């Protein structure tokens, strides 16, 4: 019906400033207004502010004083959002909205702007094996430690994958401006360990692949 | 400004069941002049748009299904699902448009049911990490029901909260479970001076803590 196409994922470092655009198309620019909803922590939804493209209307947030100013393009038929002095606080996914009445609106695909003071490293991989000599649980649990890497995301398969079954990914977490992730799967006891399996990761930033034996 | 708050946070409900959600706001938002109410539910996918199921909080918007349906006015604000289906694993939010600025609420998502629980997952640290420099070793809980969850890390007997890095996952699709890392990072000569190390957690479903912890030398 109507689609809201914005930008990519950007890579800035934190004193510069980024631009957020969102294009507009199947409708007339000049008569509807366009929202911006910044979301942070995963779940909490924060309003920027609205601009009017024919009036020149514009209001902020208090929350947004002296860090947003919208502008809109009367030729291109297209939104912009500007920010300036970026802090570590401003990472979060931002949308802009397409104000058509009171009972619907349009949302766009979202923006992921990261910031970080940050180069990009390759992944350092360590594998996991229990010490144990012998267990009393039938399954026997494998994982493999991702530390050291910039930026996301890594994928992170197990023996090229064949085995898909009972895989679990977690989140990462930022330390010391780089982040750290795990794996873990599960495996009988009839293979390990006189069959061997691999770790696989895959970073396209770096263009590198490392495969550890366990 | 006017901000809104929703109850409950979270709730385990199964395939086919009602669900009421409740939005309050701390000013009416009704409009005398329309007797309109400002106030529209929100839908969010994981990985998708947020869109709009109810407006004006008791009407319905073309594309919704018929088991979407609200009720309420100025204060109290009602969203009642008839039957819920497998694609509902949504969070829902409710936004006010009586008053600038524009506030939000806290987020509501649903989860399924139930009766998981880990036992061991401890990992020794490897022979590759010593040589970085550093010493990591983790604890995992896979298989485990609610996420509601305290870890507790003990070395030597001694409680220790520094340089626990906590991760949790969604849902599972196939089994309707959770997933749980924690990764307590140090020092090399820190590792070289103890010798046990306790992976404590204490769960819901069970009367006694399980307790774990494995030997250096």
């Known amino acids: 019906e109507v689609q809201l196409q914005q930008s990519g994922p950007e890579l800035v470092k934190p004193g510069a400033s980024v631009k957020i655009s969102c294009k507009t198309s199947?409708?007339?620019?000049?008569?509807?207004?366009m929202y911006w909803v910044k979301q942070s922590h995963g779940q909490s939804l924060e309003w920027i502010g609205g601009?009017?493209?024919?009036?020149?209307?514009?209001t902020y947030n208090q929350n947004f004083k002296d860090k947003a100013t919208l502008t809109v393009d009367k030729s291109s038929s297209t939104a912009y959002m500007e920010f300036r002095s970026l802090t570590f606080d401003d990472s979060a996914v931002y949308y802009c909205?397409?104000?058509?009445?009171?009972?619907?609106?349009?949302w766009g695909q979202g923006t992921l702007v990261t910031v970080s003071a940050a180069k990009t490293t390759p992944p350092s991989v360590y594998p996991l094996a229990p010490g144990s000599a012998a267990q009393t649980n039938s399954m026997v649990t494998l994982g493999c430690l991702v530390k050291g890497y910039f930026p996301e995301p890594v994928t992170v398969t197990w023996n090229s994958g064949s085995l898909s079954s009972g895989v679990h990914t977690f989140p990462a977490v930022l330390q010391s401006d780089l982040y750290t992730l795990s794996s873990s799967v599960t495996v009988p006891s009839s293979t390990w360990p006189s069959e061997t399996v691999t770790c696989n990761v895959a970073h396209p930033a770096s263009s590198t692949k490392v495969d550890k034996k366990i | 400004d006017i901000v809104m708050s929703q109850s409950p946070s979270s709730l385990a409900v199964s395939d086919g069941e009602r669900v009421t959600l409740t939005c309050k706001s701390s000013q009416s938002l009704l409009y005398s002049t329309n007797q309109k109410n400002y106030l529209a539910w929100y839908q969010q996918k994981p990985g998708q748009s947020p869109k709009l199921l109810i407006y004006w909080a008791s009407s319905r918007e073309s594309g919704v299904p018929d088991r979407f349906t609200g009720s309420g006015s100025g204060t109290d604000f009602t969203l009642t699902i008839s039957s819920v289906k497998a694609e509902d694993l949504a969070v829902y939010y409710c936004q006010q448009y009586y008053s600038y600025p524009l506030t939000f609420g806290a987020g509501t998502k649903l989860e399924l049911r139930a009766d998981a629980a880990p036992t061991v997952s401890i990992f020794p640290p490897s022979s590759e990490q010593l040589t970085s420099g550093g010493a990591s070793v983790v604890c995992f809980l896979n298989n485990f029901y609610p996420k509601d969850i305290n870890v507790k890390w003990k070395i030597d007997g001694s409680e220790r909260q520094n340089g626990v890095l906590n991760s949790w996952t969604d849902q599972d699709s196939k089994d309707s479970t959770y997933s749980m890392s924690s990764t307590l990072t140090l020092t090399k000569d820190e590792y070289e001076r103890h010798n046990s190390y306790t992976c404590e957690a204490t769960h819901k479903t069970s009367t006694s803590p399980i307790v774990k912890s494995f030997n250096r030398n």
């Open positions: 909205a397409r104000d058509d009445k009171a009972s619907f609106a349009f």
């Open positions: 199947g409708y007339t620019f000049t008569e509807y207004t």
């Open positions: 601009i009017n493209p024919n009036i020149d209307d514009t």
